[PDB]
C-alpha cells in the first residue's frame, strides 16, 4: 500500500539502531566490540542473555567479522540480525 | 517492554508467515507469494514487479537449497540484501 509497511519500518529500525550504536566511538559507520556489546545488552535483552564477559564479545565479533577488520559494519550486522531472528523463529515452528 | 530492534525482528517473522501461508506450502514463499510480498510490502524500496522473468531471477537468487521456493532463512538473506542496499541511501 501507500503507507510504510511493517516490513519497511522494520528495516528502517534496523538501520537506526545500528547508527545509534555505531556512531558512539571511533568509526561512526562500524561497531567496535564495545558498541556491539552495548547494542546487544540494551536492545536484545529479551532474545539474548546479557554479555558481561569480554571473551563472549570477542567470540561474537569473531564470528561476525568477515572483512577481518575487527569491527562489525552494517552488512555484517544484518547477517547477525538474520542469525538471531532465525533462531527465535526456529522456536516458533 | 521489547526494544525497537526486537519488535523489528518479530515483524520480519510476522510478514514472512503472512505471505508464506497464502498458497501451497504454508511455510515457504513460492514465486507468486514472493511477488506479492514485494509489491505490497516493499513498494517504497523496490520497483514494482510486473514481469515473470523478474520474479524468476529473484527467486533463483534467493533459492539456495534448490527447491524452487523461499524458506525463512532464505527470506532473511533477502531482507539483509535489501536493507543493506537501502542503508547506503541514508
Amino acid at each position: 500500500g501507500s503507507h510504510m509497511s511493517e516490513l519497511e519500518k522494520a528495516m528502517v529500525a534496523l538501520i537506526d539502531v545500528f547508527h545509534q550504536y555505531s556512531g558512539r566511538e571511533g568509526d561512526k559507520h562500524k561497531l567496535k566490540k564495545s558498541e556491539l556489546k552495548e547494542l546487544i545488552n540494551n536492545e536484545l535483552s529479551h532474545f539474548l542473555e546479557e554479555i558481561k564477559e569480554q571473551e563472549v564479545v570477542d567470540k561474537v565479533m569473531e564470528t561476525l567479522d568477515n572483512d577481518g577488520d575487527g569491527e562489525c559494519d552494517f552488512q555484517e550486522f544484518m547477517a547477525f540480525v538474520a542469525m538471531v531472528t532465525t533462531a527465535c523463529h526456529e522456536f516458533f515452528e | 517492554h521489547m526494544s525497537e530492534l526486537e519488535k523489528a525482528m518479530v515483524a520480519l517473522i510476522d510478514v514472512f508467515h503472512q505471505y508464506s501461508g497464502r498458497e501451497g506450502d504454508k511455510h515457504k514463499l513460492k514465486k507468486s507469494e514472493l511477488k506479492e510480498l514485494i509489491n505490497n510490502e516493499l513498494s517504497h524500496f523496490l520497483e514494482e514487479i510486473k514481469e515473470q522473468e523478474v520474479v524468476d531471477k529473484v527467486m533463483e537468487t534467493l533459492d539456495n537449497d534448490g527447491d524452487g521456493e523461499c524458506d525463512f532463512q532464505e527470506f532473511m538473506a533477502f531482507v539483509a540484501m535489501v536493507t543493506t542496499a537501502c542503508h547506503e541511501f541514508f
Partner: peptide
C-alpha cells in the same frame, strides 16, 4: 523469549 543465549532486484529513488 527463552532465550537463545549466544553463539548461535531494483531499488527505487526514495527521497
Amino acid at each position: 523469549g527463552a532465550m537463545a543465549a549466544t553463539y548461535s532486484r531494483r531499488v527505487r529513488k526514495l527521497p
